[PDB]
Structure formats: C-alpha cells, structure tokens
C-alpha cells in the first residue's frame, strides 16, 4: 500500500534490515557529587529501564553506562564512534541527566556529567562525523536526551546529515508529585513507540510526542528535535 512502498523505498526511507540493527548507548546519570548541588535523579533508573527495553525490542545492542563524569561521557561516546558499524544500519545514543542551556545554531543544549561539568549537545553530536565514523555515514544517528532543567556553505554540501536529536528538558514526572515515578517525557515517548513504531517513522512518533507535550503545559515543549535525517526512519519492530 501507500505505507508499504514508503517503508521500502530506499530513496525515501533508511533501510533497517540488519539484525542486530545497531548499537544503543544509554548514559544514565542518577547520582551527582554533593558539591555540584545537583539532586539525585531518582526515577531515572526506571526511565533507563524503559528505554533499555524499548531499544532492545527494536533490535539494538543496548549498553547502559551509569553515573558518568563529563569526561567519561565523552570517552564513552568516542568509544562508540570508534567502533565498526559496518554491519549495522543505525546508531542510538540516549542521555539521561541534568542539563543546562548552551547556545548553538544547530544543536543547542548541554548535559551535565555526574560531576556537574557540562557537555554540549554539539560536541556529543559531532563525535559521530563522517571522518571519525565513516562507518555510520549515510546511516541515521539518533540522539534522545532527557536533560532535566537552499543549502549551507563553507563549500556547498548538506551538513549536518543523518543526525536526529530529540532534546527534552521537561521535568514533569509520570506522577506529578512523586519524583521517583519516572519522567513524563520518557513515558510519553515509550508509550507512543509501543503503539506506533511498527507503522510510523521517527518524525511522526516525535510529532505525536510534541502533540502530547503540548496539551500537558508548554513553555518548555522543548523536545525541540533537530532533524537532519535525509530519509524517513522506520524502526525494525519485533
């Protein structure tokens, strides 16, 4: 049908046929040094488990690395970028931590390591470039960040490319009074995936999320995705 020829169209959708689909790194920062003044992110462990289960079922080799300092987050990301993604179709990075603003014309935002040291989303994203990781060239590089708070030139060529960043600073909990209940944004994302990943691409999934975030409040509604994918992304469902 109309949805079947779009999912297969190698010109319109990324081909996600390999098994496993790719790596999925989840940085889960829960405990921060007393000195930073950042509160323990209780409920993050359940957010992590939800996403870990989500991407596993989407065929990604999920690795959870918890409580990373800024430097170790970078190392862990350089490590992931340094691997051979030759037999994989996609890469996923999930960061759960406290965050802060960091201006940037394409990938604004930053996240803190357990040390309260910032790591900008730009640095995180550029770790996976076509020079340090040609292995992921032309393949979707997804970034899901929960950080609780014409053509360009110079040389004409579309860049960033095949990069998708969903950056959320929505602090709400599934149970608005219980900080241990889990992140509202994570739950909403998981929920939407469970019901629509099988038939809808990433853009549509996040549009549904944005739609939800919208009737929940909105001043934040900053999952402000930075979509630089060149094709539609349909996950490989169970």
């Amino acid at each position: 049908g109309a949805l079947e020829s779009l999912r297969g169209n190698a010109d319109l959708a990324y081909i996600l046929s390999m098994e496993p689909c790719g790596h999925c790194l989840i940085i889960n920062n829960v405990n921060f040094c007393r000195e930073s003044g950042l509160r323990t992110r209780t409920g993050s462990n359940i957010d992590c488990e939800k996403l870990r289960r989500r991407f596993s079922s989407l065929h990604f080799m999920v690795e959870v690395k918890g409580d990373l300092t800024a430097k170790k987050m970078v190392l862990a990301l350089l490590e992931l970028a340094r691997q051979d993604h030759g037999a994989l179709d996609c890469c996923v990075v999930v960061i759960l931590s406290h965050g802060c603003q960091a201006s940037h014309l394409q990938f604004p935002g930053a996240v803190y390591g357990t040390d309260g040291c910032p790591v900008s989303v730009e640095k995180i994203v550029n770790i996976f470039n076509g020079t340090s990781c040609p292995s992921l060239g032309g393949k979707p590089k997804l970034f899901f960040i929960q950080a609780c708070g014409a053509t360009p030139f110079q040389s004409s060529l579309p860049t960033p490319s095949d990069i998708f960043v969903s950056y959320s600073t929505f602090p709400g909990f599934v149970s608005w009074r219980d900080p241990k209940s889990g992140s509202w944004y994570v739950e909403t994302l998981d929920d939407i995936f469970e019901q629509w990943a099988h038939s809808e691409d990433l853009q549509s999934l996040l549009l549904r999320v944005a739609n939800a975030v919208s009737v929940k409040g909105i001043y934040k509604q900053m999952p402000g995705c930075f979509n630089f994918l060149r094709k539609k992304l349909f996950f490989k469902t169970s």
């Binding site: 014309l105 394409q106 004409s156 549009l207 944005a210 402000g224």
Partner: protein
C-alpha cells in the same frame, strides 16, 4: 548577541540585495534575517551567522532558516519554538 550587529536592522539587510537577480524574493530573505554576501545567491543570518546558497524557485526563507539553523535566536524570537520544531517534525 548577534554575530553581525550591523545587520540587526531589516533596512541594513535589504540594502545588500541591491542588484538581486535570483527568484527568491529579497524582501522575504531580509525579513528572515538574511543579508546578501555579494557572491552568488549566498546569504547569511545577521544573528546566528548561518549561510544558505542555491535557493530554489518557491522556497521560503523562514522554513529554510528553521530547517538548517533551528538554534538561531533571531529565528526563535520571530517565530517561536513551536514553529521551529514543527518545521523539523514535518520534512
């Protein structure tokens, strides 16, 4: 703070499109924060500094601006976050 304070005003920006021979409307470009560089149909935003070239016939400067530079503050100021995200969520 803008990367080019001298182009913060629409009037200064439209000025640079003196002899503009391209199909993309120069008034729209200037309103969208762009100013011509003097070579080809190349323009840059006075605030974020992002540059765009090779414009298509019926291409909207604001959409292109949001599509490529979602983090521009002038863009956010003028169009709001809902606008930017929606641009990115409906390619």
């Amino acid at each position: 703070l803008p990367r080019n304070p001298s182009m913060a005003d629409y009037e200064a920006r439209i000025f640079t499109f003196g002899t503009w021979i391209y199909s993309v409307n120069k008034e729209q470009l200037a309103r969208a924060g762009f100013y011509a560089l003097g070579e080809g149909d190349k323009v840059k935003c006075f605030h974020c500094g992002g540059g765009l070239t090779d414009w298509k016939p019926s291409e909207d400067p604001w959409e292109q601006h949001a599509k490529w530079y979602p983090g521009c503050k002038y863009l956010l100021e003028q169009k709001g976050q809902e606008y930017i995200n929606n641009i990115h969520l409906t390619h």
